[PDB]
């Protein structure tokens, strides 16, 4: 008993957009283990329930007092005196405590903070770092430092610009260490700021939610030459690839079955799903585009399958809203050959055990896995340890700008230093 969970407590804290979210502390004799839950803006319809208060008098209804009360009054009392090492057992207990398929009773945002903090308490009980403890839970044979995929130019749901597609990313795939990867990323980011300033003016270099630039660009093609120019100017020609997150559901209209690529402008631009495929095949030809995430709407399995086939061996197709880190949706995607990469978001499913199960299922069927932040982040660094623990070789956790992004990148520096010069870096298929 002396080694078990002593206290569990949740509290409402602010995310990087200033919106409330949930943080949980699990206390054992080894210390206080604290985990915070991120929050999406472009959330898939199939994501686990993010439980908000709806009280217009607080945070215009975005409070997390109810989720916090669920931690303090329901989940925490159940956990006291339990063996924190029993991750699957305690995650399953929390699943059953909720009793609903979407975690709509307790909230995925109450459960997840507990699931995370348990695993950190357990790591401390074993006397190993989090990444080591998670690698044991996942059965990972080789740890690796991931290639960071940096969202440096944007165009989605609140960003401050006309740009319709969400993320234009640069990835230092030819770096030979994480230290080198991160420096090169920062250097290109800095070069890009100057390029944007000269082309669009001083007003154009303020940052989006994930620390990238949101220049006054409307057309989805326009960021790409600019990215190649920044890569060149920074002195890293040939070292970089591009990844896209289209978040294409956010532009899609169900009744018309077409995509609006000015949805943030007075006049609409209606474009079809093969007008899209045309664009994607062209992108992949014209630029070193190694990854395209959510190229289509979250239920367009046929669209996804079409582009996955057409770019096989050249450009991975990543499910995010399609798959929502959920073994059931992932099984549908496998059956239809809809995609070949999982965007892994612990808060899309709501427990560590389930997120690990999703990663294992995807890898066993030959997919890559890109561990991901949400557009609403905190100072939490869990995903840095998680990506190394899964050995997946791919992370997206922001531009190299804003503390809720750099905190993960910095944690990756710390892990890299612990693992030493023989630690593997990057994604072998891109190296």
As annotated, the binding site for substrate includes 158, 167, 293, 320, 372-375, 396
The reply to whether 378 sits near its own copies by the rule CB under 8 A is: yes
CB of 403 to its own copies, least distance (A): 3
Neighbours of 262 (CB within 10 A): 17
Which of 15, 23, 320, 354 is close enough to bind Zn ion by CB under 5 A?
Answer: 320
259 in Cβ contact with 251 (< 8 Å): yes
Element (DSSP H or E) covering residue 178? helix 178-200
Residue 263 engages its own copies in binding (rule: CB under 8 A): no
Residues 359/319, Cβ–Cβ less than 8 Å:
no
**250 touches its own copies by CB under 8 A:** no
Q: Binding mask 11-30 vs Zn ion (x if CB under 5 A, - otherwise)?
A: ------------------x-
How many helices (H) and strands (E) the chain has is answered by 14, 17
Site size toward Zn ion, by CB under 5 A: 5
Which of 6, 28, 42, 397 forms a contact with Zn ion (CB under 5 A)?
A: 42
* Partner whose binding site includes residue 204, from Zn ion, its own copies, none (CB under 5 to 8 Å by kind): its own copies
Binding to its own copies (CB under 8 A) within 31-70 occurs at 31, 58-60
Beta carbon of residue 176, minimum distance to its own copies (angstroms, whole number): 16
The reply to whether 128 sits near its own copies by the rule CB under 8 A is no
One DSSP character per residue, 82-134 reads --TT-HHHHHHHHHHHH-STT-TTT-HHHHHHHHHHHHHHHHHHHTS-HHHHH
Distance CA 34, CA 411 (A): 15
Using the rule CB under 5 A, is 406 a contact of Zn ion? no
Give residues after which the chain gaps, C-N over 2.5 angstroms.
Answer: none
Helix ranges, 234-321 (H): 273-286, 301-310
The residue number with the shortest CB distance to Zn ion is 42
First-to-last C-alpha distance (Å) of the chain: 48
89 is catalytic: no
x-or-dash pattern for its own copies, window 176-215, by CB under 8 A? ------xx--xx-xx------x----xxxxxxx--x-xx-
Tell me, yes or no, if 312 is annotated catalytic: no
Contact 33, 44 (CB under 8 A): no
Contact 260, 268 (CB under 8 A): yes
Catalytic annotation, pick one of 62, 239, 345, 408: 345
The smaller minimum CB distance to its own copies, of residues 139 and 266, is found at: 266
Q: Does 405 bind its own copies (CB under 8 A)?
A: yes
Residues that bind its own copies in the complex, under the rule CB under 8 A: 11-19, 23, 31, 58-60, 158-162, 182-183, 186-187, 189-190, 197, 202-208, 211, 213-214, 216, 264, 377-379, 399-407, 409-410, 413-414, 417
């Amino acid at each position: 008993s002396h080694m078990t969970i002593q206290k569990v407590h949740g509290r409402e804290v602010l995310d990087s957009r200033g919106n409330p979210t949930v943080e949980v502390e699990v206390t054992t004799e080894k210390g206080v283990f604290r985990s915070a839950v991120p929050s999406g803006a472009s959330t898939g319809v199939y994501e686990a329930c993010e439980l908000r208060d709806g009280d217009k008098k607080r945070y215009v209804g975005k409070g997390c007092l109810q989720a916090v009360k669920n931690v303090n009054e329901v989940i925490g009392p159940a956990l006291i005196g339990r063996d924190e090492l029993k991750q699957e057992e305690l995650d399953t207990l929390m699943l059953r405590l909720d009793g609903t398929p979407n975690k709509g009773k307790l909230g995925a945002n109450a459960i997840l903070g507990c699931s995370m903090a348990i695993s950190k308490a357990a790591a401390a009980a074993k006397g190993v770092p989090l990444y080591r403890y998670l690698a044991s839970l996942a059965g990972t044979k080789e740890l690796r430092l991931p290639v960071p995929c940096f969202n440096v130019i944007n165009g989605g749901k609140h960003a401050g610009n006309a740009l319709p597609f969400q993320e234009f990313m640069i990835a230092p795939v030819k770096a030979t260490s994480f230290s080198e990867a991160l420096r090169m990323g920062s250097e290109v980011y800095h070069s890009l700021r100057g390029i944007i300033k000269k082309k669009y003016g001083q007003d154009a270099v303020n940052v989006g939610d994930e620390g990238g630039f949101a220049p006054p660009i409307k057309d989805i093609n326009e960021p790409l030459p600019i990215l190649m120019e920044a890569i060149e100017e920074a002195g890293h020609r040939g070292k970089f690839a591009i990844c896209m997150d289209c978040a294409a559901s956010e532009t899609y209209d169900e009744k018309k079955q077409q995509y609006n690529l000015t949805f943030k402008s007075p006049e609409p631009t209606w474009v079809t799903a093969e007008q899209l495929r045309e664009t994607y095949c062209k992108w992949a030809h014209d630029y070193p585009i190694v990854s395209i995430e959510d190229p289509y709407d979250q239920d367009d399995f046929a669209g996804f399958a079409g582009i996955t086939e057409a770019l096989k061996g050249k450009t991975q197709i990543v499910g995010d809203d399609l798959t929502v880190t959920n073994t059931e949706r992932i099984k549908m995607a496998i059956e239809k050959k809809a995609c070949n990469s999982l965007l892994l978001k612990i808060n899309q499913i709501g427990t560590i055990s389930e997120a690990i199960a999703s990663s294992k299922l995807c890898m066993e069927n030959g997919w890559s896995v890109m561990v991901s932040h949400r557009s609403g982040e905190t100072e939490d660094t869990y995903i840095a340890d998680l990506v190394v623990a899964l050995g997946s070789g791919q992370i997206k956790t922001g531009a190299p700008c804003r503390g809720e992004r750099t905190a993960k990148l910095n944690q990756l520096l710390r892990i890299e230093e612990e693992l030493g010069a023989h630690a593997k870096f990057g994604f072998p298929g891109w190296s």
